[PDB]
Symmetry: D2
Subunit: 489 residues, 4 copies
């Protein structure tokens, strides 16, 4: 293995698991074993819960500004170790260094930095009732919460969940994806160095069916935040509900539509469509995988997509010049290739790509070529289902109302976007699109201030923005009676 054995992080240090079992994390670019990683047992979950209960008390007893300063110190460390953490994320995920060095830690720390400054701004309400009575609310910490991460942006997701949870005075137990456990453990080390109390951010490694479920079932955990697939999310939310009625945030899957209107800058439109499909090798939840183009512009648009796709630099993600890496794992590659074969079988027209890249060293990795299908139909499997790989589906439409109806005809509702130069059309279309994250003349930017999450089966709750901080607190209403009390008895 490249690295030493990775252990559980509980109480400000690494501790041995008690399962007697490990799993391997693999580098998807070459099949190299990166590390053996311990599996947390049911007793380890209990241990992390008790540690979080005690640690949360220390954390909540500090002043708001003391918490703020500690989180700001964590941000400073993250900025300092940006390139080091980026190199690790690239090993674990296969995403290009060009991406990890500029996105993953940058934007994860951006959100932690944002919430760090807001700790003193967490306030309740005061409501007078009459001269002799008034109400005030408190926004108290939930206590111990759990985060369950996904494998596409491991440390970014860890930061986006832990930052508001910790800013709101909670302790979080975090379970990274079995596929990508490494950077989450580094984050825990950084929080401790920054001054976060022992127990406040603990990390348990292992599978979802076990460790994830033990967390979602635990009676002392007050909230679960999960990022991953919709089918899995339903199961997680159900377990969280039936066990102890936990509060939930779910950031799930999508089949987001990008509508290119006839008055769009077509070069901007093609830049947007390729960014919305092939960044992180197509493994982004918000990807615009159904691209709607007017019939009159189909040929011109295909030419523009083809030109951009042909110059994608697929390669070793450790090369600075690479902008397109392998997929995260060999099993994920198999799944994506299955969807590609489905697309061919249902007679979608293959424009670009469509197979595994095996030339030379690439045969050692999980590389799928950027793939574009056109002449697509709404009932096709590649159009209806999330592939979570580099596969764009181009759909022809004839009128604006039709495009919007078709865009909305899905159980998903994560993101949506339009490309048009018209003031009226831009806002009117976007207001009609049923998605939580809406982009006009752009795609993919997710500022710390902007709440993001899904409509419909794409999610519950939100992340980022002021609203998310409020949602990691629970409301206590206090009525103060200053006058008489009348009983009817």
């Amino acid at each position: 293995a490249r690295f030493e054995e990775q252990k559980l992080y509980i109480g400000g240090r690494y501790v041995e698991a008690s399962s007697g079992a490990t799993f391997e994390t693999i580098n998807p670019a070459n099949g190299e074993v990166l590390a053996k990683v311990q599996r947390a047992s049911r007793e380890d979950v209990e241990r992390a819960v008790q540690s979080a209960v005690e640690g949360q008390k220390v954390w909540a007893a500090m002043t708001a500004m003391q918490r703020s300063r500690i989180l700001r110190r964590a941000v400073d460390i993250l900025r300092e170790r940006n390139d080091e953490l980026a190199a690790l994320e690239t090993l674990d995920t296969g995403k290009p260094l060009a991406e990890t060095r500029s996105v993953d830690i940058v934007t994860g720390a951006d959100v932690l930095e944002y919430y760090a400054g807001l700790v003193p701004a967490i306030e309740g309400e005061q409501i007078p009732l009459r001269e002799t009575s008034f109400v005030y609310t408190r926004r108290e910490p939930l206590g111990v919460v759990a985060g369950i991460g996904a494998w596409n942006y491991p440390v970014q997701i860890a930061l986006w969940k832990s930052a508001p949870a910790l800013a709101a005075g909670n302790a979080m137990i975090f379970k990274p994806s079995e596929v990508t456990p490494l950077t989450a453990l580094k984050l825990a080390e950084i929080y401790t160095e920054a001054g976060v109390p022992d127990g406040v951010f603990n990390v348990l490694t292992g599978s979802g069916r076990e460790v994830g479920q033990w967390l979602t079932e635990h009676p002392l955990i007050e909230k679960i935040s999960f990022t991953g697939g919709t089918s899995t999310g339903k199961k997680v939310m159900a377990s969280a509900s039936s066990s102890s009625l936990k509060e939930v945030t779910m950031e799930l899957g999508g089949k987001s539509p990008l509508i290119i209107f006839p008055d769009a800058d077509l070069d901007r439109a093609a830049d947007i469509a390729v960014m919305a499909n092939f960044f992180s090798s197509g493994q982004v939840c918000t990807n615009g995988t159904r691209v709607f183009i007017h019939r009159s512009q189909q040929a011109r648009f295909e030419a523009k997509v083809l030109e951009r796709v042909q110059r994608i630099r697929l390669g070793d993600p450790q090369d600075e010049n690479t902008n397109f890496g392998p997929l995260v794992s060999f099993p994920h590659m198999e799944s994506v290739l299955g969807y590609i074969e489905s697309g061919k079988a249902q007679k979608a027209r293959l424009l670009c790509g469509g197979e595994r890249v095996t030339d030379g060293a690439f045969g050692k990795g999980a590389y799928v070529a950027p793939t574009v299908f056109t002449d697509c139909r709404d009932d096709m499997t590649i159009v209806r289902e999330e592939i979570f790989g580099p596969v764009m589906s181009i759909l022809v439409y004839d009128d604006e109302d039709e495009a919007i109806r078709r865009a909305n005809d899905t159980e998903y509702g994560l993101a949506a976007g339009v490309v048009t130069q018209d003031l009226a059309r831009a806002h009117r279309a976007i207001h009609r699109l049923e998605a939580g994250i809406c982009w006009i003349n752009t795609w993919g930017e997710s500022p710390a201030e902007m709440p993001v999450g899904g409509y419909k089966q794409s999610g519950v709750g939100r992340e980022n923005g002021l609203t998310t901080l409020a949602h990691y607190t629970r409301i206590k209403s206090v009525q103060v009676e200053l006058g008489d009390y009348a009983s009817v008895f």
Copy 2:
């Protein structure tokens, strides 16, 4: 039957169900059959959903002030028909006319009135990112939502759920308890009379395991709001989750503590304790069923409680002089008597009542005497478990920290309260009590402005207050890019 057969309410009128099945609603005061009530079929659920989808479009298309005026008109009608509706609620629930004429419709309409005024104040945010880009958010309706009511405050709970739903621009399908279906239908008529579009408030009658379940499973319903038992709430929330990842509000059970500190005026304390236990014959979710009294004041406190409980006027709820009616049903009375016998068996000292009242006409109704146990212990079944009847448990303590520790030692967290004249003690204690609804020197008041709901296994989300209106909307973030777009490809 006292009244004609009750039909479903869909699309601004009554329609025939398609189940070919009915159930009865019984007057718990005298066992009389009040009405046959139709059971909705799965197809009737589909019918109600399609009606709601279309009606919601009409409703949302109006201006905010147009919706507000219509809701304010519904309020005016509710005030005008307060006594008539109260008469009906008393028949269906057995609650005293002195309660139904003063509380049920009064406080239900108060919440509708509150939200009616806030329709034009529902706003999103705007955030500048840079000269060339900004974000704005929209708070959009969820669309079609479903409310599932409880039997203790039928029309009030219908109003507390439907008011913020409609004010936020949604359509609601409401399922009242099988035990108490009558007033929800009247509310539906009133909304139509007020100018609410057909389909915006539909009412389906039937069972929780049938009609309730079909609503929680329906993929076009975006949110479920349920009030009822904690064990039932878990199944409901899990169903809502597993099916289509619906947003959820849960207002569930409690075993709420009332702590009487030694400096308290015992007359006020006794008044609060009695009000917190025997109002609506103890059928109130927020009731202060665990009463903590200091060892030095147990005797004096018990005397003041007995004094008050003795003059409780149990009787015909049709009598204005009555302040304590029968329970809502015979099976519930059976449940309550079961707990009372458990109290006796487990060595709790019986101070008041503890028997079914069967003299004269009371034998034909479901009357349980106001019951007080004392010398209780935390391990007793009557202390640990929600009874949802007129059974007060008095517990002795020795010091403040012990009292608060014991108050918090439950899986519940709905309400909590303290009685003390000391400024420091009042706020300090209340801040440590783990409940969503906290009262100082009072009990039971639930102003429209005050968000109410449970900590822990007592709930998810809140009702009333500004925050609840917010939670019947979904956030859409719109990023407007005014400048160039850079692609890495």
Copy 3:
């Protein structure tokens, strides 16, 4: 006269002034004496203040919903009396019935309705400091406030000031313009009929130099809200400050620019330009009196403006078909004609109008033709100074940056607007314009929800929207210390 003598309104009824002085209000269409009106003495101001102090206590002692219901009742009465008040406003101001029946009371009551619904939403904050201390704020009424009205929209201005004042729990003494006293007295009757307590809205008639000044100087008045000219506003605000440091709102003059970009539909641009200059005969503070047109569009634009100006229906404001009435007075007309003559003297090109209309019965009124100058230059008097009459100045520009710079080159900053179909240009340009009220592809609409007021010398503070209700309260911060107190002594 047309009506009987109008007296002061103090304490829920009309009372005799103690000045022994009266003035006449005249119908500007025909010179008819409408009424003798009493002038408040210094003694009467004192009487109004004492009445307001006592009334404010009664009003503030009610619950929020009680105040809401009373303000909602006043709205109902205003809707009922809409046509009658419009008729009165038309007599007093000379504005066409077509305008007063659809704008003045409608939009005035719209704001009162808005704030009526918001009364229960006025809340303070709660901020925890540590375990042993927390802060809550109260948003308390200021107490007695004064509003000083303008003559162009008499009752709408009375409503826009009094509505948030009363909603926030204050009493207001209102001084309508000496030119237009009639509708303010009717509003006072209406508030009383709706249930507003005696003293909460008192009306004193008379001059700005006497009565207005005595209110602005009075030490028991806590806030002054003034609408009128910038020159006068400076003096009012200075007097409010030097007397007793009152809070202030000032809605003043403007020379607002309208920029028509070359991609604008010119029919729409001309419609906007004409509406922004000739509604209420050009007597609107927010009018777009500097109209910027690109050189390439100048000729076509002038032709389209000319077409519309030619079919403007000047005439008797009593005739429902009139859409352009006389000015408010002969001295005001003389001022406007002076500006028109300056325009001619300074070589601006006269496109339309430019003189008094005297034909037949029009000689008995103060009628000025809708006037358009073109080929204007930035240093012309008509371009630099507010005319407050029906005079449009059209200015040619060559590039976007130039237009925006010239638009901003004024001491005024009330409104600004752009007409363009381009998404990026619409927002980019508007973000750069230095005005409080900005319109894209429209002009003149002022929703109750939308805060309005001036940048620079056009205003201090805002009217309408949530923010304005807040500014009719004063913040009290309350720190509750629950723990020990440490002294250095």
Copy 4:
């Protein structure tokens, strides 16, 4: 002189004034000339304005987080240089090192730190009107603003004014008191070193009647924030209004009441009263200079006050053991002694002090002993007027309503406090006190989160808290019309 000639700070560096004139700043402990300081000319004011205009554009063009990080860097430097700055403040003000090292920079920096984290939280609103139109607001910087500081807390006031002004994207020109000009110049160096762009914080030294007036009259400055006496504030606010209608914040004088209720612990009451009168040698605007005690507890309270006053450690402010220093200046000392003599002449009973201290080296300084008058009456000059020195007035009352009425009977309204252990009375009494800053069972703490400012003639607007940041922005409302535009012409 102890130090070199002090210059103006404009554009990120020191520059020579163009007046040809200087003034001296004197150490009040010993009369030593600390430095000659340049007087700014009218042309220097113009230079600072032009510098601020350009600097503000650079500052506002950064992202919110870029501004946040720079202000956070300034906080870090202030923390590093706390003791250094404290020592200079002690020289310039005479305040004890024990105070300046623990309060002045600590709490000034606390507010800068608070606002630094809030920069990304400044948001506008979004309001839908109908399908075809919506409004968004922007909170834009005012531009260039000016702050005029007072002499009692020179660097803290410079920070409390500049922090929200800079955080909101403005440049500020700051004019410290002529009495204490030294630390404001150091703050300017620190902002520059932290990365604040040249011109964003400029410092001009000189008199109030000259430099202060030239700033208040300048047409390019959009807001004035002034801290000082009420009499002076009226003139400053009037000049700001009459010149160009500037926005204003005024933090002015007080005669704040402290009410000690008869259930209060007299030791705690005495600690509060002494802290509320003698901290910073009585030179605090919010001081509780009118102390109300129940008639029956006057004797006992006087003895506890006398006990603590006798042990107050008056001395050299450079001695760490000193907790009470000389007054800020010899002319201020003379004013204070004049008030003391008025107290004697009006036959208030002198309990402690009441003389200048001249023993030994104290004779070279401006030392006035801690002074306590009792048997005071409401019509005495010392009770009516702000002394701004170490002079406590003790007043006997008989009932709560009387105490409150008397507490409120003043033109001032800055602060107020009550001492009581009773829950009801604490909140009831504090709700009735007409002051913006209210303390329960404490005095003097002013957390960054807590808005502070005066009712009545003690202020306009607020400092600190979320609300203050909002008041360093101006609201722009943008209405976007997406549909048709209708003209009446």
